[PDB]
């Protein structure tokens, strides 16, 4: 079965740069599933994790019709 | 068998809403991911509904954890 296309909400989008523009929503060709987390330096202790990992909630949407998409967007071929 | 940390350059970064910011990307790639830019084919009808142009990721492999930003997002690539 071909890895149905998933729309990652505008909440989260990519930013490619030159000049300054370019913010494309995200599409997933998820074969294997991807995990996303937020990390931050541990600058107030030295027995605590070097970095603080806070898993991130991806509210991506599964799609049925290609008409729901925008003219340009990035596609994470989950390869 | 791995995974090593890979820093995806500034060129490419994730983003969040309104005044909000961007975070560089780190990969715990299990599988080596592919990325591509797509576009609707609004001037034709015989060539792909969308323009898939594979995208070049200039990510860097990290040796030290000291090279990392204070904040950032990690894509644990299962
Ligand atoms: C689970 C959401 C993963 C989205 C991050 C995609 C980063 C680009 C890898 C090429």
Swiss-Prot record, chain B:
Short sequence motif named Nuclear export signal, residue ranges: 26-34
Residue ranges occupied by any 9b domain in the UniProt entry: 1-78
Location of this chain's protein in the cell: Virion; Host cytoplasmic vesicle membrane; Host cytoplasm; Host endoplasmic reticulum
Keywords: Host cytoplasm, Host cytoplasmic vesicle, Host endoplasmic reticulum, Host membrane, Host mitochondrion, Host nucleus, Host-virus interaction, Inhibition of host innate immune response by virus, Inhibition of host MAVS by virus, Inhibition of host RLR pathway by virus, Membrane, Viral immunoevasion, Virion
Record flagged with keyword Transferase: no
Superkingdom assignment: Viruses
InterPro entries per record: Protein_9b_Betacoronavirus, Protein_9b_SARS
Cysteine disulfide partners in this protein: none
Principal localisation: virion
General function of this protein: Plays a role in the inhibition of host innate immune response by targeting the mitochondrial-associated adapter MAVS. Mechanistically, usurps the E3 ligase ITCH to trigger the degradation of MAVS, TRAF3, and TRAF6. In addition, causes mitochondrial elongation by triggering ubiquitination and proteasomal degradation of dynamin-like protein 1/DNM1L.
Record text on subunit structure and interactions: Homodimer. Interacts with host XPO1; this interaction mediates protein ORF9b export out of the nucleus. Interacts with host MAVS. Interacts with protein ORF6.
Protein name, per record: ORF9b protein
Organism field: Severe acute respiratory syndrome coronavirus (SARS-CoV)
């Amino acid at each position: 079965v071909p890895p149905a296309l998933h729309l990652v909400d505008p909440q989260i989008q990519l930013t490619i740069t030159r000049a300054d523009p370019k913010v494309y929503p995200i599409i997933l060709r998820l074969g294997s599933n991807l995990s996303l987390s937020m990390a931050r330096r541990n600058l107030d202790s030295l027995e605590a994790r070097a970095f603080q990992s806070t898993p991130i909630v991806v509210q991506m949407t599964k799609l049925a019709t290609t008409e729901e998409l925008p003219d340009e967007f990035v596609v994470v071929t989950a390869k």
